[PDB]
Structure formats: C-alpha cells, structure tokens
Amino acid sequence: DYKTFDPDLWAAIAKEEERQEHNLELIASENFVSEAVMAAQGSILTNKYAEGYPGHRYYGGCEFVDIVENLAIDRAKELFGAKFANVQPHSGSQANTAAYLALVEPGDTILGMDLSAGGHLTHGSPVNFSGKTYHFVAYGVDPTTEVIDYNVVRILARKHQPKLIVAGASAYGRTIDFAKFREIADEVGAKLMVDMAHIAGLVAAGLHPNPVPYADITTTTTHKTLRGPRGGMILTNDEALAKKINSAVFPGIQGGPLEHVIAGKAVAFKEALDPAFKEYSEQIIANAKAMVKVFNQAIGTRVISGATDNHLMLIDVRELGINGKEAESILDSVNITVNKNSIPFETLSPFKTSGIRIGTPAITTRGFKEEDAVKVAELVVKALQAKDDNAQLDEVKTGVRELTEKFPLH
Template sequence: MGTPDSTSTPFWGPDFAALQQSDPDIAEVVLGELARQRGGLQLIAGENFTSPAVLAALGSTLTNKYAEGYPGRRYYGGCAEVDRAEELAVRRACELFGAEHANVQPHSGAAANLAAYAALLVPGDTILAMSLPHGGHLTHGSRVNFSGRWFHAVAYGVRESDERIDYDQVGDLARAHRPKVIVCGATAYSRLVDFAAFRQIADEVGAYLMVDAAHFIGLVAGDAVPSPVPYADLVTCTTHKVLRGPRGGMILCREELAGRIDRAVFPFSQGGPHMHTIAAKAVALREAATPTYRAYARRVVANAQALTQGLQAEGMRAVSGGTDTHLALLDLRAIGVSGGDAESRCERAGITLNKNAIPFDPVKPMIASGIRVGTAAVTTQGMTETDMKEVALLLGRAARADDDASLRDVRAAVAELVSTHPAYPRR
C-alpha cells in the first residue's frame, strides 16, 4: 500500500513508524482503515471520529498499568498517576451532566448495563424495557443476551399508528408485572423520550428507573436534547458515538446508589480497568464541556433532520415521521429495496450504514425492511445541512443501483464530497 504521507498525520507521531517496522501487516490494516474512514461517508449512527488528543491518550503508556480498584483504594502499587486520570474523568462527568456520582470504568455500554442490573437486581427479577424489534437493545432483555436469560424481561414497544413509544402500554405493563427496574433508551428510536412520564410510572410501581443513554448522551452533553439525569436513578451510556470519545462505557447515578454501582463494576463484573481508555474518556469529557462542542451537538441534530428530509424526497419513509436526534430509521419498502441490499450497495459506493428492522417488520432482521443512518461522524468532518442534501441524493442513487457502473459513479461522487471535508486531514 502506498503511504508516502502516513506518518505526517497529526496523531501518529514517531510510534507509528515503529509499528510499520515491527509489524507491517498490522500497520497496513491501520492505514487501510484510515483510508476507508477518509475515503467514504460514515453514516453508522454509533460511530464518530475522536480527536487526535483522545487518540493520543489511548495510545499512551497508561495502557501498561494495572489498577484494580478505585482511586486511593487500589490493589496494586504505583497508581498515583492513573488515580489522577480517573479522578479527572469522574469529576468532569459529574460536572458535565450534573450527576451525583459517576463510574467511568465500564469497558462498554453492555458492560455498563450488566453492572447496573447487578447493582439493582438478582436473577429472576423482572425488568421492563423496549422491545428489540421496535428499537431497543440486546441488553434490554433479548433472549440471546444475559439480560433475557437471567431476568424476566417484559417488553414495551411503539404504537403502530405513529411508531412512537406507547406510554399507556408502558404503564399498563408496569402495573401488571411490577418490574424492579424500568429501562428506557434505545438504539434505533429517533424521537425524544419522555423521561418524566417514565419517572411517574416507575414511582407508581416502586421501580428503579434506568436510562440507557448510550446513543444520545453526547447530545445531552451539548444541550441539544433534554437530560435524563434529573429523572433517572441511574444512567448508563457509552463514551463513543456522539460524545466523540474512546470506545467505552460509563454510569451516572444518584449518590445513594454509588456504592452498589461501584461494587457491581469492580469486583463483580470487571477486573482491572483500562486506564488508557479512562484517560481518553477524561479528554473527551473536557472537550464536550466547550462551546465548540455544544455548537457541534446542535449541528448533528440539524444535519440528521436535513438528511432525513432528503431521504424522504428519495422515496424512503422516515419511521415515526422524522427525527429529533442524531439518527433516523428509514423504511425502504416503497422503493422496492431491502435493508440488506441497500447496505451492501451503499458500502460498494463508499457509504457505510446499517440495515435495520423497522417496527412491525414483515421480514427477518438479517434482511430487514429499513436502514439506520446517523450524522455524528459527517458533522465532525464539518458537513452542513446543504451537504446532507447531496448525501441523501447519493445514498438514494446507491440504494437503487444494481450494477457496478452506477455504483462506481456514486463512489466517485462520494470521494469528491469527502475530499472537501476530510476526516483526520493531512498536514
């Protein structure tokens, strides 16, 4: 692979040259992924581009340190510096989100959910959460996941009439099943969640309210959507996606749950934390506290709405009629294309997105009637609502194309567009 300028990018530094020398195969993979990210449109709703500063923390010597336990209470010596990193991350998380307590050690959003359940439940307890086919998550009670195997999971969904959460159904199910935990939050639901309504239902049945904010916590940080923190007993989230940090998880909770949450993370469900990742989380949280980031978060939503409108003009029906967040779910049945085919064609055209089931989908999930798109990454690149109109046109062309020549034409147009808004620009 020709990479004459590979070491001139702002985040590799001299260590990448060492990787090229010691393991050229992996170096080629890393450079290949960099080229893929630079050369196409990244519309996966849960993906973004971290800053060079976040990448620098991830690639630091903090990866060498074992630090089981918590700051000031470690099981290993030599933790003074990593203690500072974790304390900064915790303090910044609490300040940014107005939380009473934060645990920044979970390795992922799923790990954060596991710890949250462990803090509040015992096997066999009942949880009430959003149905996976209607936009929920595997860890919200799917039978193939620990959450559905260890707990009695009851699912609520959206109304068929408008594809929005049926709060009457949530209340009826809560009263009928008396869950110990009610979970709200989703991976493929584009509308704002009424946290006050969930809080009222949880109080009525004596349940804990857990908000899985993995997808939208970055929008909360940027004041682009309402915060669940004042309403929830605990909030789980990821630190990547819109928040633009490293891949990882985090839990925010009320002070009275702090000890239970901390013990559920360590020692119950995890051992040594990834201190390089925690440092990178601290960097991202500091970045998210700036006016620049708040402007970014608002642009993410505006771009998502513009992209959704453009895709509707291409004949794709927006589930629930639109979006209030960073993502949209599109029903492709009107254009005669499955979600699986659209994903494959778009990838060949340099547009990365995912097939996705729609509520009440008549076909299997691996085929799917819809696609899910998100605007976090393209907004990080500096794209605007005007650019989203062009993205919608290109996506529509790619989804309908069934020949290589048409897809090559779209790919060329995609390359031209992203060249004016490069990810990780060369210096």
C-alpha cells in the same frame, strides 16, 4: 520502523485509515475521536494495574493514575450533573451489566424497549445476558405513529409489576420523555434505569432532556455522540446506589480498569465542556433533520415515524423491492456505510431486516453542514433507486468522492 517487524498488521491499519477517509460513515453509533483522545489511548497508562478506586487501590504506584481517573469522574459529574460517576466499565454492555446488578436480582421482571422497536440487545434480548438473567417484558412503539405510546407502557407496567423499567434505545429517532417513564415507574413501585448511550453528547449539550435527575441509574457509552474512546460509564444521584455500582463493577464483574482508555474519557469530557461542543451537537441534529427532509420527499425511502429529534433515522426500504441487507450492500458498493436495521414490527429475520439506520455524528465531525447532509441523502436515494443502472451508481460514487475530498480527516 517497528512497522518493518510486522508489515502485514500495519498494512491493514493503513488500508483502514484510507477506508475511513474515502467512505461516508453513516453508522449512527460511530464517530471520529480527536488526536488527543487517540494519544491518551496510545500512552503508557496501559502498563498500570489499578484495581479498586482512586485513593483505595490494591496496588502500589497509583498516585498519578488516580489524577487521571478523578479527572474523568469529575468531568462526568460536571457534564451531566450527577453526584456520583463510575468511569471503569469497559463498554456499554459492562456498564449495563453492573447497573442491573445494582438494581435487581436474577429472575426479576424488567420492562425494556423491544429490539425491533429500537431497543438495544442489552435491553432484554434472549441471546444476551439481559434476557438470560432477568425476566424481560418488552414495550415497543405504536404501529401507526412509530413513536412510544406512554399509555401503552403504563398498561404494561401495571400488568407485569416490574421491579425495573429501562428506557433508552439504539435506533429511536424521537425524544424520550423521561418524566413520563419516571411517572410510570412510580405508579407501579419500579425503579428507573436510563441508557443514554446514543444521545449522551446531545444531553451534555442541553439538546435532549437530561435523564440523570429522573433515573435511579443512568448508563452510557463514551464513544457515540460523546465522541470519546470506546468504553462505558455509570451515573447516579443516590449515594447508596453509588456504592453498589462501584462494588458491582469491581470486584463484581471486572478486574483492572483500562486507565489509558479512561484518560481518553477524561480528554473527551473536557472537549465536551468546551462551548464548541454545543455547536457541534447542534449541527448533528440540523444535519439529521435536513437529511430526513430529503428522504421524506423521495420515492420509496420511508422515514420511521416521519421525523427525527436527534442524530439518527431509520429508513424503511420495502417500497424499493429490497430488504435492509440488500440496501446496505448497494450503498457499500458506492462507498456509503450504513447498517441494516430492524424496523418497528419487523417481519423479516434480524439479519435481513426491512430497513437501514443512518446517523450524522461522524460526517458532522468531518465538517459537513446542512447543504452537505442534503447532498448525502440525495446520493443515498439515487443509489437505492438506481435499480442497478451502472451509469447511476457510478455518478453516486463520484458524488461521494467529491464530498470526502471537500472534507478530509486530520
């Protein structure tokens, strides 16, 4: 009805609904939120200005909005065991901005994971506030094993004497050893920040070591393996840092929080407290390992580091005569969505790349089991091996159609 007033906009949204139904979303950072999360974001909480924190707002009328924000704070403390939580960051980027503000001064030396090795842009990129505002020195992975070499990180720390070490990654498929990062931080007098955005759901399910007891500050997004709305979060066990975090978020770098999004965070956090969430997260990892077993035994799809401990994998496609941008293009043509992704010691442009990144949280949410993940990896292999044999790309398109129809959305 209101769609009559703006048919162009609602038409685009309908096509996007259909695109999400008909494609296999293998983007490691995406998911499908519940009906309840979307209803919270579609609520009248968008109308409320609520600057400040629960019980000490700068506006009238927040007495019931404060319940929502307290639910999100307290469910985060329950899920992750943090003594303090801040649920107002608009995004992972704002969450990391405020975490740095609470820990270091502009120009300070910070050790963070290199982008090609799998770090995030906010872990030290020169085109990002992180690299522009602080002096970042990168660590990476070993060139042969493609996992983090903790003794190399240790050497780097003692050489550079950073005020802060950042751990966490956008494209690292192996377990991060937070105990060792804390060990190294302590040796050089540095604080430790962990960005668990990608693994937060796995951490909540007890399937990846929990960084919260080790890190001075833990940041996260709410929309990856946690399966919540797009937004950020900051955790800490230190009451003094909690006060600095809160001031840094507001009035430091934000104004009004998005209380409708925060309600969706509260919704998603109770979903994650349900025993069914542990089974979901278990299935994410099983599906991912199943998929890595297929790629390991295929010709020309080299799995970075040869294994996965979590939800994602990086695939080196150099053996196939293509770069990551071309691989992403082939797979889109058959309704399989991935992203081109730099690989350790990447030699091509960050917009060409030698690889693609694949993750299983979204298809697992659709209901894929181990057998279905194997099928996806085989269609991916077939499409990249089909050096443009139209007959084969069309078989793959059919295999995708078969899978989406067996696992429709709500």
